């Protein structure tokens, strides 16, 4: 909406260079502080203030995310039907073969530190969301 | 290459501004160091008493 | 309109070709004719083209006289302004109503408004008659739009 | 080459007034932070007494 | 006043204007009025 | 990348400090144990610092404030971390009725549209005063700033100094006879919410083994580097996360009131999770909590778009 | 060799005589190895020299029948010091593990340890890849004298 056509469906069309960005600020974070609680599946393990800043004619030049309270306290031991971060989950089932070995992975619950071994997510596998956010680093 | 110059002097002058704000904020912070310290102070002192 | 200025005009029809025989698209009708001392609006030549989409537009053929007699019933005309008409006509951005006028905002109305300008429309009319604060004064810019 | 220095200096100086305003509203804030503390300070001292 | 929310995240129609302020009933579905249609409509527009 | 020697030679010995100078110790299994847990977490939470600052860094004269609070968490045990979450949360139906109500007529006002001002009885800062407010009688959050700095000061004794600053206020509930556990209801308008108030103290504070942590310090990795530079803020025998947290909370808050709202009243169909289950009575509750009776009789009269008139005329 | 190559082997040969003579030392050898395509170590030219000191380094003589046998030699070359080797080579003094060296060090490592340099042959090989801290990073500095 705001920003400037390059040029210029579903969801698939041509977004802008930082505008991209914008989308994929997002799930870099959902990756690095996003856990599922027996709430919701996707929580947010730390709550955000955003901020789109508009320039002078109007465009988006800003877009300002700030954290507060990262619920930390979980890492370690999540009670009953709960998941830590999801970034650690897909860590270890996206993993190509050189990092799984660098970056030393041994498999799902080869950590104690997550609990109800690997809790399953709805409609999304972690497998695959590993290889999207990986990409989404890159546009960023 | 004499307009420009004018516009020059112009942004160092708007750079100044934004420096006595943000010394004032530098002033600010170091009030408030002899402040909060202070109070920390005066706690610990009214624990005692 | 005299021979003479008819001819210029059978030029400005004859440069603006297509398949060789004396067929001009009805996209180029009313850009001819602007320069052609005219400012026709894309209503007014909507009307005496006959309203077609964009399809039809970039497609249907004008020819000489189809395009001269488009010319001349536009051409002798009703309401076209003045300088009282566009000084009221653009104080059409004064914000609070300061005898300068509204950067962004003149650029949005082009964008906004009925005959929808592209941005590149809109920046060229507009950029450079705005100040610091982006204040155009507008007394003028209304004189700069009419004539020129 | 004089023209693309000057059309710029004109912008950035708007994004110094973004920043501008910014730091007064931190500069209220600090004078608040401070008065807090003066306050709590004022205060400890003469519950002190 | 229950007769106009209720039935109307129910009626898909999750945001609701009360005024500006719409009130809203989280779905936890792919809800599909986010799409370039959704943006390129809305883009820049007038809100009718 | 920091040392591999030292990180377990400090984590089974803190050649640590009592005074101020050097003292050895031998930690205890139970000693040892809690520490590296300390550690495990911590080293997350120091790289999303990192993160979420490298993220604003590529995406970073107006600006529109979004605000996704991890949110009206009522869980069963609700610790310090739901409390200060629900904290905002009770913020933000009051953001709602200084605003709809009050600032979106505000903002009405100024511009001085014709605007007949509406209120509901719908002020809500006495429950927020009982989480916020640090002298007079102290919060919730103010209290535990206090108790993070004191020996003979208890989780337990934070409720007592809670039951004892606040009883007679008509916004705080005292627990069903859980002094034993110690935990206080407050009434938040969507439920009364029980948080429990064990751990608190060590959260609001954050210990670890001061040794391990100058070493990842004074590690190799950038990210661990740059997270673990901070390492002046651990306590061995600092300002604590909370009123840092009120050194950052007023700005998201301040800035939220120069700044025009609008709104996102966001309901919940079921507390089940789920896609597309309502309920009947779940939602009628919050048609209530969020105050939606009251909410239609200012915007009921009242304008979604702005546009400025000047230019309009 | 192909006699294609192996005639411009010779040129460079022939452009590092000091008279026309025909005779290039063995000292130059080294460059004329280097200059066609090589990197030896100082070492695999000794050993095809026949291990001479200052003196008859200085004093004999070679012509390029005496030297396309070494070049030879070397060419189909044992092992060849990928960016890997390099980078971990250089990382040695990295006092933490951080990726960078202050460029004094560096300067200096280069003038005491292996086949040792002068100031001049450090200088122009490291200046202008310390930054603003005077830390020359070492993996660039690597990638750099391999494409070279």
């Given at each position: 909406?705001?920003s400037?056509?390059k040029?210029?469906?579903?969801p698939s069309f041509?977004?802008?260079?930082?505008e991209?960005?914008?989308l994929?600020?997002?799930?870099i974070?959902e990756?690095?502080?996003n856990?599922?609680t027996?709430?919701?599946d996707?929580?947010s393990?730390?709550?955000?203030?955003?901020?789109?800043?508009?320039?002078?004619?109007?465009?988006?030049?800003?877009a300002?995310?700030?954290?507060y309270?990262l619920?930390?306290?979980?890492?370690?031991?999540?009670?009953?039907?709960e998941?830590?971060?999801?970034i650690?989950?897909?860590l270890?089932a996206?993993?190509?073969?050189?990092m799984?070995?660098?970056?030393l992975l041994?498999?799902?619950?080869?950590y104690?530190f997550?609990?109800n071994?690997?809790?399953?997510?709805p409609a999304?596998?972690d497998?695959e969301?590993?290889?999207?956010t990986l990409?989404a680093?890159?546009?960023m | 290459?004499?307009?420009?110059?004018?516009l020059?002097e112009?942004?160092?002058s708007l750079?100044?501004?934004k420096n006595?704000?943000?010394?004032?904020?530098?002033?600010?912070?170091?009030?408030?160091?002899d402040a909060?310290?202070r109070?920390?102070?005066?706690?610990?002192?009214?624990?005692?008493? | 309109?005299?021979?003479?200025?008819?001819?210029?005009?059978?030029?400005?029809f004859q440069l603006?070709?297509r398949?060789g025989?004396?067929?001009?698209?009805?996209?180029?009708?009313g850009?001819?004719?602007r320069?052609?001392?005219?400012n026709?609006?894309?209503?007014?030549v909507?009307?005496?083209?006959?309203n077609?989409?964009?399809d039809?537009?970039?497609?249907?053929?004008?020819?000489?006289?189809?395009?001269?007699?488009?010319?001349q019933?536009i051409?002798?005309?009703?309401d076209?302004?003045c300088?009282?008409?566009?000084?009221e006509?653009?104080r059409?951005?004064?914000?609070?109503?300061?005898?300068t006028v509204?950067?962004?905002?003149?650029?949005?109305?082009?964008?906004?408004?009925?005959?929808?300008?592209?941005?590149?429309?809109?920046?060229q009319?507009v950029?450079?008659?705005?100040?610091?604060?982006?204040?155009?004064?507008?007394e003028e810019?209304?004189?700069?739009?009419?004539?020129? | 080459?004089?023209?693309?220095?000057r059309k710029?200096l004109?912008e950035?100086?708007?994004?110094?007034?973004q920043?501008k305003?910014?730091?007064?509203?931190?500069?209220?804030?600090?004078?608040?932070?401070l008065?807090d503390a003066?306050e709590?300070?004022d205060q400890l001292?003469?519950?002190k007494? | 006043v229950?007769?106009?929310?209720?039935?109307?995240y129910?009626?898909?129609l999750?945001?609701?204007y009360?005024?500006?302020?719409?009130?809203?009933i989280n779905?936890?579905?792919?809800?599909p009025?986010?799409?370039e249609?959704?943006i390129?409509?809305?883009?820049?527009?007038?809100?009718? | 990348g920091?040392?591999?020697?030292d990180?377990?030679?400090?984590?089974?010995?803190?050649?640590?400090?009592?005074?101020?100078?050097?003292?050895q110790?031998?930690?205890?299994?139970?000693?040892a144990?809690?520490a590296?847990?300390?550690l495990?977490?911590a080293?997350?939470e120091?790289?999303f610092?990192?993160?979420?600052t490298?993220?604003?860094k590529?995406l970073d004269?107006?600006?529109?404030?979004?605000?996704?609070?991890?949110?009206?968490?009522?869980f069963?045990?609700?610790?310090?971390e739901?409390?200060?979450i629900n904290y905002?949360?009770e913020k933000?139906?009051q953001?709602?009725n200084?605003?709809?109500?009050?600032?979106?007529?505000?903002?009405?006002?100024?511009?001085?549209?014709?605007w007949?001002?509406?209120?509901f009885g719908?002020?809500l800062?006495?429950?927020?005063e009982?989480?916020?407010?640090?002298?007079?009688?102290?919060?919730?959050?103010?209290l535990?700033?206090?108790?993070?700095?004191?020996?003979?000061?208890?989780?337990?004794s934070?409720?007592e100094?809670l039951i004892q600053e606040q009883?007679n206020?008509?916004?705080?509930?005292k627990?069903?006879?859980?002094?034993?556990?110690t935990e206080?209801?407050?009434?938040h308008?969507?439920g009364?919410?029980?948080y429990?108030?064990?751990?608190w103290?060590?959260?609001?504070?954050?210990?670890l083994?001061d040794?391990?942590?100058?070493?990842?310090?004074?590690?190799?990795?950038?990210?661990v580097?740059?997270?673990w530079?901070?390492?002046?803020?651990?306590?061995g025998?600092?300002?604590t996360?909370?009123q840092?947290?009120?050194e950052?909370?007023?700005?998201?808050?301040?800035?939220?009131?120069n700044?025009n709202?609008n709104?996102?009243?966001c309901?919940?169909?079921?507390?089940?999770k789920?896609?597309?289950?309502?309920?009947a009575h779940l939602?009628?509750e919050?048609?209530?909590?969020n105050?939606?009776l009251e909410?239609?009789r200012?915007?009921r009269?009242?304008?979604?778009n702005?546009?400025?008139?000047?230019?309009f005329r």
């Amino acid at each position: 909406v705001a920003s400037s056509h390059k040029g210029k469906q579903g969801p698939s069309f041509s977004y802008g260079e930082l505008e991209k960005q914008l989308l994929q600020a997002n799930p870099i974070l959902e990756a690095f502080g996003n856990a599922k609680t027996v709430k919701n599946d996707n929580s947010s393990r730390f709550g955000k203030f955003i901020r789109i800043n508009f320039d002078v004619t109007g465009y988006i030049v800003g877009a300002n995310i700030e954290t507060y309270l990262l619920e930390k306290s979980r890492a370690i031991r999540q009670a009953k039907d709960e998941r830590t971060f999801h970034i650690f989950y897909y860590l270890i089932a996206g993993a190509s073969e050189q990092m799984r070995n660098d970056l030393l992975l041994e498999g799902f619950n080869n950590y104690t530190f997550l609990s109800n071994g690997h809790v399953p997510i709805p409609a999304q596998q972690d497998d695959e969301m590993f290889q999207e956010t990986l990409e989404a680093m890159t546009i960023m | 290459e004499a307009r420009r110059k004018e516009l020059e002097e112009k942004m160092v002058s708007l750079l100044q501004e934004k420096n006595d704000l943000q010394l004032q904020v530098q002033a600010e912070q170091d009030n408030l160091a002899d402040a909060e310290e202070r109070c920390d102070q005066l706690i610990k002192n009214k624990i005692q008493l | 309109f005299s021979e003479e200025q008819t001819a210029e005009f059978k030029e400005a029809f004859q440069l603006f070709d297509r398949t060789g025989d004396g067929k001009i698209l009805y996209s180029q009708c009313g850009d001819v004719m602007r320069a052609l001392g005219q400012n026709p609006t894309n209503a007014e030549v909507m009307k005496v083209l006959g309203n077609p989409k964009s399809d039809e537009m970039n497609l249907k053929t004008l020819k000489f006289e189809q395009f001269l007699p488009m010319m001349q019933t536009i051409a002798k005309n009703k309401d076209q302004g003045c300088f009282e008409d566009y000084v009221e006509g653009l104080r059409v951005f004064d914000k609070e109503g300061n005898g300068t006028v509204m950067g962004a905002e003149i650029r949005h109305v082009l964008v906004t408004l009925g005959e929808k300008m592209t941005e590149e429309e809109v920046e060229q009319l507009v950029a450079g008659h705005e100040d610091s604060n982006g204040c155009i004064n507008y007394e003028e810019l209304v004189r700069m739009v009419l004539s020129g | 080459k004089s023209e693309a220095r000057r059309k710029e200096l004109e912008e950035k100086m708007v994004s110094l007034l973004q920043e501008k305003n910014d730091l007064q509203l931190q500069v209220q804030a600090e004078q608040d932070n401070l008065a807090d503390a003066e306050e709590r300070c004022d205060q400890l001292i003469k519950n002190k007494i | 006043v229950l007769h106009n929310l209720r039935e109307r995240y129910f009626s898909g129609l999750i945001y609701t204007y009360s005024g500006l302020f719409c009130v809203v009933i989280n779905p936890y579905k792919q809800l599909p009025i986010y799409s370039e249609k959704i943006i390129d409509m809305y883009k820049g527009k007038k809100r009718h | 990348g920091i040392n591999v020697t030292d990180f377990t030679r400090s984590i089974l010995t803190p050649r640590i400090k009592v005074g101020r100078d050097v003292v050895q110790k031998a930690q205890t299994k139970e000693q040892a144990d809690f520490a590296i847990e300390a550690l495990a977490k911590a080293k997350f939470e120091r790289l999303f610092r990192w993160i979420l600052t490298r993220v604003n860094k590529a995406l970073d004269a107006s600006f529109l404030g979004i605000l996704d609070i991890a949110g009206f968490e009522i869980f069963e045990i609700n610790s310090f971390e739901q409390l200060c979450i629900n904290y905002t949360n009770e913020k933000l139906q009051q953001l709602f009725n200084h605003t709809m109500f009050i600032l979106e007529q505000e903002e009405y006002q100024r511009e001085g549209i014709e605007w007949n001002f509406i209120d509901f009885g719908l002020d809500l800062q006495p429950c927020i005063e009982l989480i916020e407010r640090p002298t007079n009688p102290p919060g919730v959050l103010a209290l535990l700033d206090e108790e993070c700095w004191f020996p003979k000061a208890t989780d337990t004794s934070f409720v007592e100094k809670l039951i004892q600053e606040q009883g007679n206020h008509a916004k705080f509930q005292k627990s069903k006879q859980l002094k034993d556990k110690t935990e206080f209801c407050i009434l938040h308008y969507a439920g009364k919410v029980t948080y429990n108030a064990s751990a608190w103290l060590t959260k609001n504070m954050d210990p670890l083994n001061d040794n391990v942590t100058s070493l990842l310090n004074q590690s190799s990795d950038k990210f661990v580097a740059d997270l673990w530079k901070d390492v002046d803020r651990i306590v061995g025998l600092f300002r604590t996360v909370g009123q840092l947290y009120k050194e950052q909370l007023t700005k998201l808050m301040t800035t939220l009131r120069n700044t025009n709202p609008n709104f996102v009243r966001c309901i919940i169909p079921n507390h089940e999770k789920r896609a597309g289950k309502l309920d009947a009575h779940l939602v009628l509750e919050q048609l209530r909590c969020n105050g939606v009776l009251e909410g239609i009789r200012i915007c009921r009269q009242g304008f979604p778009n702005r546009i400025v008139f000047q230019e309009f005329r």
